[PDB]
Amino acid sequence: QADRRTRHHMMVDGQINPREWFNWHPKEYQPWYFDRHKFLYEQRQYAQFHHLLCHQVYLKDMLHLMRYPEPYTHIIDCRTSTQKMHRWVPHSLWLPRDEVEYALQLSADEFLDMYGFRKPDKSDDVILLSHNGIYSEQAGWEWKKQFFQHVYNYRGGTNELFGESYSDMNVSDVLSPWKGPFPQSGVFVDKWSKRKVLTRTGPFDRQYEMQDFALPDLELEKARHPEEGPRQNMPFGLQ
Amino acid sequence: LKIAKSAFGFYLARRGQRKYPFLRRPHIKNTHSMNPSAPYFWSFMTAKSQMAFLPEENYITGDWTGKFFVSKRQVYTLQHATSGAKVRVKSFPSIFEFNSPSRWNIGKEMNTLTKPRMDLIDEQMLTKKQRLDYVRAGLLPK
Amino acid sequence: MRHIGQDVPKRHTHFVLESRLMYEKSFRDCWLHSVCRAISQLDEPLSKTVVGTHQKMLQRKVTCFQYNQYGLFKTPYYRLANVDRYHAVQGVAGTREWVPYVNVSYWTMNKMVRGGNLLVHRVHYTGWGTDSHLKKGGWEHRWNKVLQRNVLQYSRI
Amino acid sequence: VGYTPVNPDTSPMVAYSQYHWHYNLPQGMERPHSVNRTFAAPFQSNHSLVNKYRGVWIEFDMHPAFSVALEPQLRKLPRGRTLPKTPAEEVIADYTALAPLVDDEKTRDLWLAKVFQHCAFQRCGGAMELWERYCHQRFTAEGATAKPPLSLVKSVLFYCNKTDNSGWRALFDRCLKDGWNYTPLFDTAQWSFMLKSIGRMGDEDGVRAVLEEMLDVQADLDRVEARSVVIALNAVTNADVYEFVKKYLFNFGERKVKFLRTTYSDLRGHGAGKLRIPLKENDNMYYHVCWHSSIRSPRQFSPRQLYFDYTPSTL
Amino acid sequence: SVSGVFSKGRGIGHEATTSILRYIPRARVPWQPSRFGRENLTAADMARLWSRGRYRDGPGNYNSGYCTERTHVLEENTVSIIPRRELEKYMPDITIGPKALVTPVSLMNARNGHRVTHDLLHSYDPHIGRLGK
RNA sequence: UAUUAUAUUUAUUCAUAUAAUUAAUAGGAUAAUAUUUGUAGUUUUUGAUACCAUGAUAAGGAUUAUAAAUUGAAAGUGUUAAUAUCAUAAUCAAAAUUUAUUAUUUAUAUUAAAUAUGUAUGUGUAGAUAAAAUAAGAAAUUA
Numbered sequence A: 001q002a003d004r005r006t007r008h009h010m011m012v013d014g015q016i017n018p019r020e021w022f023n024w025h026p027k028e029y030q031p032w033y034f035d036r037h038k039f040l041y042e043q044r045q046y047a048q049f050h051h052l053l054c055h056q057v058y059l060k061d062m063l064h065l066m067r068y069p070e071p072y073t074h075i076i077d078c079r080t081s082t083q084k085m086h087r088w089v090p091h092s093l094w095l096p097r098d099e100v101e102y103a104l105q106l107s108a109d110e111f112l113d114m115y116g117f118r119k120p121d122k123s124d125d126v127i128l129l130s131h132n133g134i135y136s137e138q139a140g141w142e143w144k145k146q147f148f149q150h151v152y153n154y155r156g157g158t159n160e161l162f163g164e165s166y167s168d169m170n171v172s173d174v175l176s177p178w179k180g181p182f183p184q185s186g187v188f189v190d191k192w193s194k195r196k197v198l199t200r201t202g203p204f205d206r207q208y209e210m211q212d213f214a215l216p217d218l219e220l221e222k223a224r225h226p227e228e229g230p231r232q233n234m235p236f237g238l239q
Numbered sequence B: 001l002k003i004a005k006s007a008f009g010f011y012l013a014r015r016g017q018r019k020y021p022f023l024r025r026p027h028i029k030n031t032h033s034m035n036p037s038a039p040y041f042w043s044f045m046t047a048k049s050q051m052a053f054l055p056e057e058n059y060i061t062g063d064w065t066g067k068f069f070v071s072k073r074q075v076y077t078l079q080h081a082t083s084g085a086k087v088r089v090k091s092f093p094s095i096f097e098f099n100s101p102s103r104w105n106i107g108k109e110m111n112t113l114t115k116p117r118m119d120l121i122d123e124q125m126l127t128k129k130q131r132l133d134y135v136r137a138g139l140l141p142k
Numbered sequence C: 001m002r003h004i005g006q007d008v009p010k011r012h013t014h015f016v017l018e019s020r021l022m023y024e025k026s027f028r029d030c031w032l033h034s035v036c037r038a039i040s041q042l043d044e045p046l047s048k049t050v051v052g053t054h055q056k057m058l059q060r061k062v063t064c065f066q067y068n069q070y071g072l073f074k075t076p077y078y079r080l081a082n083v084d085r086y087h088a089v090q091g092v093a094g095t096r097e098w099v100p101y102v103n104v105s106y107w108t109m110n111k112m113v114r115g116g117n118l119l120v121h122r123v124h125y126t127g128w129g130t131d132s133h134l135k136k137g138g139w140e141h142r143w144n145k146v147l148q149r150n151v152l153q154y155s156r157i
Numbered sequence D: 001v002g003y004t005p006v007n008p009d010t011s012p013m014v015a016y017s018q019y020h021w022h023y024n025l026p027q028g029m030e031r032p033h034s035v036n037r038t039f040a041a042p043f044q045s046n047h048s049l050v051n052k053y054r055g056v057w058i059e060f061d062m063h064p065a066f067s068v069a070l071e072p073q074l075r076k077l078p079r080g081r082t083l084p085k086t087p088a089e090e091v092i093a094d095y096t097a098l099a100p101l102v103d104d105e106k107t108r109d110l111w112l113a114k115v116f117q118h119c120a121f122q123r124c125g126g127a128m129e130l131w132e133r134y135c136h137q138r139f140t141a142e143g144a145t146a147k148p149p150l151s152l153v154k155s156v157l158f159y160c161n162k163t164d165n166s167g168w169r170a171l172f173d174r175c176l177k178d179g180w181n182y183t184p185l186f187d188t189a190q191w192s193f194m195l196k197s198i199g200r201m202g203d204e205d206g207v208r209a210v211l212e213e214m215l216d217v218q219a220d221l222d223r224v225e226a227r228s229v230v231i232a233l234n235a236v237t238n239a240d241v242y243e244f245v246k247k248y249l250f251n252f253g254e255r256k257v258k259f260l261r262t263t264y265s266d267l268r269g270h271g272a273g274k275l276r277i278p279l280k281e282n283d284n285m286y287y288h289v290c291w292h293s294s295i296r297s298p299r300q301f302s303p304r305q306l307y308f309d310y311t312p313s314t315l
Numbered sequence E: 001s002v003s004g005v006f007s008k009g010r011g012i013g014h015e016a017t018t019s020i021l022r023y024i025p026r027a028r029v030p031w032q033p034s035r036f037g038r039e040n041l042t043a044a045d046m047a048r049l050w051s052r053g054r055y056r057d058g059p060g061n062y063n064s065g066y067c068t069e070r071t072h073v074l075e076e077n078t079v080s081i082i083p084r085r086e087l088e089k090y091m092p093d094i095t096i097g098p099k100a101l102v103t104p105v106s107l108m109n110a111r112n113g114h115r116v117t118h119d120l121l122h123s124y125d126p127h128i129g130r131l132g133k
Numbered sequence F: 001u002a003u004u005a006u007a008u009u010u011a012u013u014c015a016u017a018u019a020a021u022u023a024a025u026a027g028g029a030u031a032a033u034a035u036u037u038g039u040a041g042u043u044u045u046u047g048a049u050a051c052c053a054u055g056a057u058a059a060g061g062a063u064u065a066u067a068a069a070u071u072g073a074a075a076g077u078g079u080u081a082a083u084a085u086c087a088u089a090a091u092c093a094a095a096a097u098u099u100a101u102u103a104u105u106u107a108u109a110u111u112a113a114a115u116a117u118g119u120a121u122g123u124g125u126a127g128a129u130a131a132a133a134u135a136a137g138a139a140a141u142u143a
Ligand SMILES: O=c1ccn([C@@H]2O[C@H](COP(=O)(O)OP(=O)(O)OP(=O)(O)O)[C@@H](O)[C@H]2O)c(=O)[nH]1
Pocket: D162, D196, D225, D227, D274, D275, D276, D277, F035
């Protein structure tokens, strides 16, 4: 008939019941879109870095610049480990990501002495390069914070160029299932009624929704559920 | 209201004996509708012109299964008497039937043939208090 | 329904909506109804062209048509119930328990005026008012002046 | 105070409060507002446009000499927005008989294009013979140099779609950049009809080629008629083309994609009658178009649905 | 333990679409996830519901003339219906038929937009009178 | 004690309520083209109800007086905001008097448009009651 999942309860098992429409900060109803199929750093979890992103440069631009170089466009290789880099992107130069913060604070001379090539002026085009396009992005943020006017990241960079599959960092799309209780750092007291209410941090987070969302192929999606259908634990009207 | 004789007993207030504008009292209760007049017989509580057609309610307007009672503004017609068919009207307690047909009814509305307030009173629809008050007015014997 | 998950505190507020539809039905049926009345009751000839047996015939034809119209709204306005859009309190119009320009009952007018919600102006409770016209002939006179500026100032064509 | 809230415009106890403007202050406008000027929205109605031609316009350019000379023959063929009911056999007989007498290439071909269009509206199948008899020799065969007049091509294509015909693929191919380069001059309705036909016939590969060209030529994607996109997509069963169609689906707009789903669910649904030929079952493509729609729409929060089974853990 | 208003109901939309569509989660209204609307009523129940709600004129009301009950009870008194064949003996039948209920297009503006003199208002738009379709 | 008057006038036959389903959005001529013509995913909840379910505005003269000035008051009279856990009761006409709380036409001429009151002539006649010092006209027995 009814039970803790179906009934109205302010609290279930000593913690705020996430099932109540009125236990959430109304801001959580505001409309949003799915990120996950977009480039890693455009996603919403990285929002603190969003002001910093870099204008892109596509594969076409890259081949064009291979055959037809510009004098004051610099292509800068950000690949960090020498163990993983076996080829040379034409007309590129090597500033590994790990050094960037230091490198960009050298004088023209000192920079010349440490990296063996001229430090790009702040007007010049700077194209950044990495395996996946992740380290190149982070490096980009560095170059942008010293204020460099044209900084382009080429995502998919060395992997697309050379057909290698390598990665700058090992990060995986899957989030580890949330462990503890709901964090008191996300609990949001209301200012008018002084009423405690959930936010979408923690075990409730949009990442988890997108992660477990229906697959985009009917066959793989039907494989995921029992014969009779997708949600049979629920009463018909909650399905 | 004090006693609820219908649903509205719950919703309505009496407001003591309150005055309404002329000929608008919220509830149309025609106590006078049967109020004998020989000389005014054809003009009183009937159509203002004798060239008016009979109302809607003397006619079968649509495809009907049948009715329980006909309306009380229906006018009694020679066929009401002659045809020997059920002629009912909604009065209180339940329904009044015209059983004993007469031509003297003809041409008047059944409003006028049905006494709204009967000289007859049920002692069993009355509280002991109400029965007392009906004995004071010299209606019920006691 | 059956008092399950009702949204409004008073159920009867819905009746107010029903009422609106009544007026709508009247707009749909007034012209028709009145034409059928006028053509039905006309004793003089209708016209030069329609007279005599044709006219009698046409009259009966029309009132037959009018009786056939199921659901045609013939109820006179003063017999429709006035009920508040707020608390669903009812009052008889033309009485001190109904307030006409806001169309709310006395009860709601009181509540709304005292906690400021309506903007009105208080005037001495015992007189005719600030208004010139009411000051002259009272309710009937002001009623008349309204007729005069709605209609009579026009010489129609 | 109550279950019914105050409405802030009519209540003087809101309007004249300290958080708003009192009636004794000077009542002028506070700040100006330019909304429509700063960032303006383009007009898109919820309803489709009522006057639009809704067909494939065949562009009749005739010299006003043969236009008068040929009038008793042309009066039987479609003029603008007018579709005479003359039986197609008769019209083709008239062309076969009288056309060799006319000397103009341009005239003979405008006339032919009218014949084709007329036969497209009646769905008479024996009209391709006309293509093989006159046009094929100087247009489609053995690398002939000559470049057909646009209206003729549009007409023949329109005929191959209206009468579902394998022939279209040969003509269409000649219209890409290296050939006649006619493809960027096609109407949105042209694309619509093409897609629908190809879909019925069931060529995933035709569908792919056509969607690629449409996209490159900058057709109006959102205004391609939804029914025809659905019937085309429905035709796709092959793994690679399927991949293509996901990636491609991202080219439509939010709204378009929502109604791709609605239309799809209707054509296999309630509105299965609406089609002359019933759809064929693609459960995969149906599911996918629904899924795509769901991905691209704004997301709503229904917490009792998401967290239905949530239990807290003390780990 | 369970008190319903209606015993059974039905789906607005049909097998081909639904069987596949179910693998995609749809967001229900957060505060009242289950929706049972008048499209979902059974045929019988819709008929009953549709009769009621029309004051006196409407077929639900026992005395409208459209009543299918053979008997009705006023204050413990049982009244048997007068059949129409019998009603007609004293109360003549003037019945035009359905054409009487529809005025021409010409009059639509006199009538504030309507052609139809029926008891419910009739809209010409798709949505107000929409059932499932 | 000075800053000033109740003992006048007119009234009192007082009645009116009924025929159950409150739950969502959707734009069209003179717009650069969407059939989005015809927008189709039943089913897990329970209070304002006929019913217990707090709030809030009435009426009700008794001593701040005359000048350039109001004879109507907060102590609360059905409908309004946190206690729920029997029930569809609501006017769209034409309808059934028991309810303290209501100024009706009284003798020349008397029912025409929504249908509109048939009853009580009795020596202005018991007991008991009502109203007024304000554009009217009243004058002498405070705590
Ligand atoms: O978007 C729409 C809406 C409606 N229709 C209508 O559907 C009817 C039958 O639907 P079909 O779409 O099966 O017919 P069809 O291909 O032969 O029609 P054309 O589009 O080629 O003319 C067609 O005859 C047309 O009137 C559409 O074709 N497209």
